[PDB]
Amino acid sequence: KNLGGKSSGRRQGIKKMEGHYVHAGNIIATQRHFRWHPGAHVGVGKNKCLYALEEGIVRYTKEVYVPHPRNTEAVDLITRLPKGAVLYKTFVHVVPAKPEGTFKLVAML
Amino acid sequence: VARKERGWRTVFPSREFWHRLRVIRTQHHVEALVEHQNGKVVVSASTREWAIKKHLYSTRNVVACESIGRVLAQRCLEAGINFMVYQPTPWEAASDSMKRLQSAMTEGGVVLREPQRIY
Amino acid sequence: LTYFSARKGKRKTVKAVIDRFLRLHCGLWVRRKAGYKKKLWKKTPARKKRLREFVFCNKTQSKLLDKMTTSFWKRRNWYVDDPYQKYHDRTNLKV
Amino acid sequence: KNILVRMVSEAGTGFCFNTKRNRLREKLTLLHYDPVVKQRVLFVEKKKIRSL
Amino acid sequence: RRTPPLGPMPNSDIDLSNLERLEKYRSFDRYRRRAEQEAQAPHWWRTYREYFGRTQQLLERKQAIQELRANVEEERAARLRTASVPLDAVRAEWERTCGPYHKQRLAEYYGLYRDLFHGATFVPRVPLHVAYAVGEDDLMPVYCGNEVTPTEAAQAPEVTYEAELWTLLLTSLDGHLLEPDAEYLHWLLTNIPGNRVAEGQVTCPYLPPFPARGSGIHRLAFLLFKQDQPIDFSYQLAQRTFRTFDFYKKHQETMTPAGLSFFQCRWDDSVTYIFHQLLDMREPVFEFVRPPPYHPKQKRFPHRQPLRYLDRYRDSHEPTYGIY
Amino acid sequence: YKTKPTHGIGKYKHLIKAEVRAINLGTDYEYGVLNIHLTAYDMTLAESYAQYVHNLCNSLSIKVEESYAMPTKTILTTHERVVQISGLSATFAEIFLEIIQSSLPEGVRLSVKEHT
RNA sequence: CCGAGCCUGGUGAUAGCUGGUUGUCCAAGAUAGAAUCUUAGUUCAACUUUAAAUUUGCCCACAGAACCAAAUCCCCUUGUAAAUUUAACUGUUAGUCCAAAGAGGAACAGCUCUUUGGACACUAGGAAAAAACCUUGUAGAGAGAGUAAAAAAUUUAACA
RNA sequence: AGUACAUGCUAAGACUUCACCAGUCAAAGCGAACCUCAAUUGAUCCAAUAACUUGACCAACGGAACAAGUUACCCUAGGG
Ligand SMILES: [Mg+2]
Ligand SMILES: [Mg+2]
Ligand SMILES: [Mg+2]
Ligand SMILES: [Mg+2]
Ligand SMILES: [Mg+2]
Ligand SMILES: [Mg+2]
Ligand SMILES: [Mg+2]
Ligand SMILES: [Mg+2]
Ligand SMILES: [Mg+2]
Ligand SMILES: [Mg+2]
Ligand SMILES: [Mg+2]
């Protein structure tokens, strides 16, 4: 009497892992719950998929977690913590390699 | 033209700026910083500084906040930083002394809104 | 399809392909997306943006369409004001 | 419980868009965006499409 | 497979069996504060910083603070938040005591030390001031960090500083056209007697700055050296080029910097004049040209791609006909 | 990750409790949950004394469960407040009790009765 | 020869089913799966064959991969020679057993269902006979030589 | 199911239920203020509609436009 449950895998996870040279708009990681948090030049979509926003190299660090105070769940979970405890969570950054553009000669008046 | 750290979306504060004013109101002294994205302090305004401390009655009130607002707005006028992205938490934004700080920023000549990057 | 017809002995095009697709002379097939006019009350505007597009076909899919039409539909057509006229050639290929 | 209705332009004629509305509440008058006048235009509900 | 960690485990010393006896996060602010001090602290894992990185004066201050707080009017204006502070006296006393600290901060932000002196920092003790005379009515103050149009900077400055010989450099550390390392001088007045500028020995004559069109902003540093012993030194752009690093190194035995003030220049019509009239130059025009946008290798069969894919890879947007 | 040296840098449920007799085993003698009925003729005095005893409880590391009250009675109306207190030592019991004894403003009686 | 006569014609009707498909040599050449009035079947796919363009393919090391055990992913050096793309098609996919991590069944079955690694459908020696166990692979002649794996060991109870 | 009517127009680059069809995220730009949940669903042709749109428990849910029981009279090509 166990009907259903024949759903296939979601095929989520990390798409462009640390060390991979990544251009603009590429999806870094798709996740179901907040496994990762965005860092520098990294954006998040509505379905909690996590993309690179500038061209560069994907790097994974681990940083402090000091969320927005309107998100009352995480902030109230902060006010359940003792004095020495601060949440650390994993962050994704893209180190930008290619520069902004170059000053070059155009017209010689 | 230069990039901003446009991400850091889930976490507070947002890093999509070039210069950040951060005010910590301690028990005794209120300070306001103007920073780059590197974490490096560009412009400092502290009541731990005798030239502004000797002209104030108490180093923490609305009066000291208005005084250091005038001081840092002046300082950014001689420092050439003309544009801002400032993020207060919603309970502090409703406070009277730091909305007087925002008014001081507006009258000083430093706009509390950086222009958008040109792509 | 019919490989040898009973009157002429010629190949026959399936007319579904002709009435549903578009052949570019470079070898590409243009189609609409399935269901761009069905149940868009429940559809987010990103989805109806994506569904309202002229979409190409896969390699095997394009060859399966090429085998199902004949040499008349494979030809250079020099119309007056065809909107798709600029897309008939493939440029700057390095394969 | 809900009805899918058609929401018909007062300005930007020939332009309509559909919404969901309760079976019991009142008749929709809305401010949508018409691209023909490319402005915010009041829309009025005329005909229901399908009660789901 | 669990491996032991390298350094100390965070949030481990507080891990007790009775967390209720430990004092608690009541607020939202203490947490972000503590997280800020630890985020500024280095760690042994990979972090963001790795990749993106006497008594008499005190007694007098205490007496002045006691005398100022004893006034009934000051307290009454403070409790009614109507009290104000005169900015001129605060600006002056900032210029005396703790101004140079903010000056090293502003100069190190602008990359002045890392290229001007190759990282050799100093303390500009002198409360320097410069002004460009605009009209007969006003004068534009060159402190450190501002912007001056070259119309305002067309004429030789007036330099005011309260001190007691001196040398005066104007450096354009980024205005060079050929070398990406050198810099162009504009004026350099050695053997200054006291605080008067007109009696000094000019080495190179004053030239207005030239920020070319589209070359962004150019930073201009007023560098002011103490001088112990008078030292003899020495419109062609090949003669206006040198480096400040080895130039300071050749004389640094009796040569100490004590004043900095840097400001910005943009393109305007006076820059057209400074190329045209007395330099006799056609103006080089620059534009910020972006790199071309990314597109992948053009596939044979663009599966699921839109029709626009035949315009990503097209350079000319006109109907070509080939052999016909 | 499970195999990196930084395993579990972000775990927090070991720092959170995601969830009564006296505890007197052999050496650590402990009160249970208390009930202090501050009964007074005035709402103001009883409320202020409840506030002050709560502020001495939270400043001396005392667990306070509830600060509720029962309804008044018609007689003059008799108000009261209940302050539940857990966490004491015998020396601390003497000191906290004598502070409460010496802090009574005007005619307010005390109680240290147990639960139920 | 009647649960619906027989003969001729349509009719070489139809059948996813059964069986059969004929000279030689060489070379390349074996097990994911998703759908499907679908599990005796077919399409896509995976693998495979040929030809062509181009440059990286495999093994991989520091670093790195979340809160509620084996391991795996990414991965420069190094060893190596293959890989991607284009053009064009055929053919195979209830596999069986063993070791290991699991489930159902009796913690029976030469029983059924996932994952990893072998082997059999490809040569030979050995374990008695031996698809799956150990040794061993690229091809021939020799009335030469060195080896691999390769033989079951056990026989007992007095008591103050 | 709920709120809202920019749940607007376009447009680099990617993910993807082991194929396809399907789905998803989206930099920048124009135009403006200043979405949550996990599944919450259905293709083609055909119909209604001037148009925009809409139509199945087609739930046997990749759906043929609509078709039940029984044969110890059963028959045929196969398999155990
Ligand atoms: Mg499952
Ligand atoms: Mg499955
Ligand atoms: Mg036949
Ligand atoms: Mg062979
Ligand atoms: Mg069959
Ligand atoms: Mg590699
Ligand atoms: Mg051999
Ligand atoms: Mg797929
Ligand atoms: Mg956008
Ligand atoms: Mg079915
Ligand atoms: Mg089906």
What is the Cα–Cα distance from E127 to E134, expressed in whole angstroms? 22
CB neighbour list of residue E258: distance below 8 Å, 6 or more residues apart: E122, E123, E124, E125, E126, E163, E224, E225, E226
**Domain tally for chain F?**
1
Of E173, E235, E250, the C-alpha closest to E204 is E235
- CA of C20, C1' of H45: distance in angstroms: 12
**Which two structure tokens, joined as six digits, stand for B3?**
């990039």
Domain range for residue F73? Answer: 1-116
Length C41 CA → H38 C1' (Å): 21
Q: How far is CA B16 from the centre of its chain?
A: 15
| CA pair distance B104, A86, nearest whole angstrom | 35
Judged by CB atoms closer than 8 Å, whether chains meet at F10 and A82 is answered as no
CA distance E20 to E240: 73
Contact B15, B37 (CB under 8 A): yes
> How many C-beta atoms lie closer than 10 Å to residue A52's C-beta?
27
E-strand stretches of D1-52: 2-9, 16-22, 29-34, 39-51
Query: Residue A91 contacts by C-beta under 8 Å, 6 or more apart in sequence?
Result: A36, A37, A38, A39, A60, A61, A62, A63, E48
Handedness of CA C57, C60, C65, C70 (dihedral sign): positive
β-strand partners of D7: D17, D45
Q: Which residue of C has its CA nearest to E305?
A: C55
- Cβ count within 10 A of residue E214: 17
| Contact residues on chain A for E34, CB-CB shorter than 8 A | 83, 86
- Report how far residue D41's alpha carbon sits from residue D9's, in angstroms, rounded to the nearest whole number: 7
Count the domains in chain A: 1
| Beta-bridge mates of residue A49 | A30
CA distance E215 to E107: 21
Separation of alpha carbons B38 and B36, rounded Å? 5
Q: Quick check: A23 CB within 7 A of strand H?
A: yes
User: Among D20, B114, B68, B85, which residue's Cα sits nearest to residue E94?
Assistant: B68
User: Distances from the Cα of A101 to the Cαs of E109, E177, E288, in angstroms?
Assistant: 22, 18, 7
On whether the CB atoms of residues B4 and B117 are closer than 8 A, the answer is: yes
Q: Provide the 3-class DSSP secondary structure of residue E62.
A: helix
Residue of E110, E288, E286 whose CA lies nearest to B1: E288
- Residues of A (50-79) whose Cβ lies below 8 Å from B: 53-54, 64-70
* Among candidate residues E187, E210, E194, the one with its CA nearest the CA of residue E286: E210
Ordered alpha helix ranges (H), C1-95: 15-20, 45-51, 59-66
Helix orientation angle between B62-79 and B96-108, rounded to the nearest 10 degrees = 30
Contacts of B110 (CB under 8 A, 6+ apart): B73, B76, B77, B81, B82, B83, B84
What angle in degrees, to the nearest 10, is found between the helix axes of B62-79 and E87-96? 60
H-state helical runs in E177-302: 244-249, 269-276
What residues contact C16, with CB distance under 8 A and at least 6 apart?
A: none
Decide if A78 and E290 are in contact by the 8 Å CB cutoff. Answer: no
Say yes or no: Cβ of A65 under 7 A from any atom of strand G.
no
Query: How close is the Cα of E82 to the center of ligand 8, in Å?
Result: 69
| Distance between Cα A20 and ligand 6 center (Å) | 11
Q: What torsion do the CA atoms of E185, E189, E195, E197 make, to the nearest 10 degrees?
A: -90
Cβ <8 Å between E307 and C58: no
Instruction: Please give the sequence-ordered ranges of beta strands (E in DSSP) within chain A, or none if there are none.
Output: 13-14, 21-22, 27-30, 37-38, 42-44, 49-52, 56-64, 88-96, 102-108
Of the candidates A103, E5, E311, E79, which has an alpha carbon nearest to the alpha carbon of residue C92?
E311
Cα–Cα distance, C48 to C37 (Å, whole number): 9
Q: Report chain E residues touching chain F, CB-CB < 8 A.
A: 1-6, 10-11, 15, 19-21, 23, 45
E99 close to B75: Cβ distance less than 8 angstroms: no
Place of tokens 């300005």: D11
Dump the DSSP string for F17-40: ------EESSS-EE---EEEEEEE
Closest by Cα among B11, B25, B8 to B100: B25
Q: How was this structure determined?
A: cryo-EM
The H-or-E segment that residue E38 falls in is helix E29-40
In three-state secondary structure terms, E118 is coil
Chains D and A touch (3+ CB pairs under 8 A): no
Distance from CA of A108 to the nearest CA of B (A): 24
Measured between CB atoms, does A40 come within 8 Å of chain B? yes
Is B39 an 8 Å CB contact of chain A? no
DSSP strand pairing (E146-147 vs E255-265): parallel
Residues whose CB is less than 8 angstroms from the CB of residue E11 and which lie 6 or more positions away in sequence, other chains included: A84, A85, A86, F15
Which one of 1.20.120.330, 3.40.430.10, 3.90.280.10, 3.90.330.10 gives the CATH number of domain E97-277? 3.90.280.10
Ligand nearest to the CA of E303: 8
What are the distances in angstroms from CA B114 to CA A53, B45, B57, B102? 20, 21, 34, 15
Contact across the interface for A101 and E283, Cβ inside 8 Å: no
Range of the domain at A14: 1-109
Which residue from B62, B74, B78 is facing E145, i.e. has the nearest CB?
B78
Q: Is the CB of E299 under 7 A from strand G?
A: yes
List protein-proximal bases of chain H (any atom < 7 A from a CB).
1-18, 20-29, 31, 35-37, 41-44, 50-56
Nearest-angstrom CA–CA distance, C44 and D15 = 19
Q: Is the dihedral of CA A29, A33, A34, A36 positive or negative?
A: negative
Cα distance between the two ends of chain B: 7
Q: Token pair for residue E70? A: 């004893």
Q: How many CB atoms are closer than 10 A to CB E140?
A: 17
**Contact status, residue A66 vs residue A108, Cβ threshold 8 Å:** no
